[PDB]
């Protein structure tokens, strides 16, 4: 208990929620500041399942700002619940 873990839940608006295809996009959307953690295959709409891509940060820096940056032009179809957090203090 001491690591800061964030959580980004991305979900495609279309019923063609390609989770595995999103997997590749997830890696490229990850904050260039640190590294990822572990993703979650959780459902949202009637059949649209999102992926909660968490990230493990600690010795890193505020370079994770790149995440919000990529959000300014991220999956326009797959809007993310970019409000999840997990402060493991």
From Swiss-Prot:
CDD domains referenced in this protein's UniProt entry, alphabetically: EF1B
Family: Belongs to the EF-1-beta/EF-1-delta family.
Keyword terms: Calcium, Elongation factor, Protein biosynthesis
Protein source organism: Methanothermobacter thermautotrophicus (strain ATCC 29096 / DSM 1053 / JCM 10044 / NBRC 100330 / Delta H)
Listed InterPro entries: eEF-1beta-like_sf (IPR036219), EF1B_bsu/dsu_GNE (IPR014038), Transl_elong_EF1B/ribsomal_bS6 (IPR014717), Transl_elong_EF1B_B_arc (IPR004542)
NCBIfam families for this protein: aEF-1_beta, PRK00435.1
SMART domains (alphabetical): EF1_GNE (SM00888)
Name of the coding gene: ef1b
Note: Binds calcium.
An annotated Gene Ontology molecular function: translation elongation factor activity
Cited function: Promotes the exchange of GDP for GTP in EF-1-alpha/GDP, thus allowing the regeneration of EF-1-alpha/GTP that could then be used to form the ternary complex EF-1-alpha/GTP/AAtRNA.
Protein name per its UniProtKB record: Elongation factor 1-beta
